Design a protein around this ligand. Structure first.
Ligand SMILES: [Zn+2]
Length: 257
């Protein structure tokens, strides 16, 4: 029912999901001069060498690449986190034009897309229990800007044809998520929420300062997907991003000065 259109888009979500107007909603604009450099923040630890990708799926709002999360094979720790967080899936948010598409913005600047690597706190046993906790998830957000091609993104781009419409899925094994990381792991961090319904306020956001660049032809392929299911009128999957929410009672911390 919810989507990104004029009739069921972000401005309407509060009717079915009242938490939409909550105290710790995401995304938010990152004001770099107001962000507090915090020296007690530990470096992030990304251990994705044993990652096992399984499937790619068009869910009607974005495409998700899913990972085997039955064991600690791809984890995130350190930074502002306590405990180990397992990678369960990653997905993107993009625009109809290169000047918009990201959910978070930096001093109001919008990027072409935003990658979200979603992890859940192992102390809670499964993803479903984790979303019910204030520290249940850790999402790593990476901005994409249009420039040179990202070689490690091509495997994802080539398979989009196969999952053009809502509900389609394809086997997607042996994909290494390390190919999507920028050089630097400097970041901003703040307490927030999922950016799509149910909008649960269970996320510790870790947004990387350095964007990765992808080519114009790579982002073009994303824009060829459909929100609709097979046999329905075609609605191109573009602009699946939620606009920035007020910061309210929160402080954004930076791991760098
Ligand atoms: Zn997302």
């Amino acid at each position: 029912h919810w989507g990104y259109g004029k009739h069921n888009g972000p401005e309407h979500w509060h009717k079915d999901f009242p938490i939409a107007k909550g105290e710790r909603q995401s995304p938010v604009d990152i004001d770099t001069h107001t962000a507090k450099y915090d020296p007690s923040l530990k470096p992030l630890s990304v251990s994705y060498d044993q990652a096992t990708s399984l499937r790619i799926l068009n869910n009607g709002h974005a495409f998700n690449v899913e990972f085997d999360d039955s064991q600690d094979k791809a984890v995130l720790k350190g930074g502002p986190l306590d405990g180990t967080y397992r990678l369960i899936q990653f997905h993107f948010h993009w625009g109809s034009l290169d000047g918009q598409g990201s959910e978070h913005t930096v001093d109001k600047k919008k990027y072409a897309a935003q990658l979200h690597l979603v992890h859940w706190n192992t102390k809670y046993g499964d993803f479903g229990k984790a979303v019910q906790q204030p520290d249940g998830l850790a999402v790593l957000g990476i901005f994409l800007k249009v420039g040179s091609a990202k070689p490690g993104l091509q495997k994802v781009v080539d398979v989009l044809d196969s999952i053009k419409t809502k509900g389609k899925s394809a086997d997607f094994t042996n994909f290494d998520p390390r190919g999507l990381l920028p050089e630097s792991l400097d970041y901003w961090t703040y307490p927030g929420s999922l950016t799509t319904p149910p909008l649960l306020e269970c996320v510790t956001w870790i947004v990387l300062k350095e964007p990765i660049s992808v080519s114009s032809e790579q982002v073009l392929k994303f824009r060829k997907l459909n929100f609709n299911g097979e046999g329905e009128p075609e609605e191109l999957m573009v602009d699946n991003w939620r606009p920035a929410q007020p910061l309210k009672n929160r402080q954004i911390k930076a791991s760098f000065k």
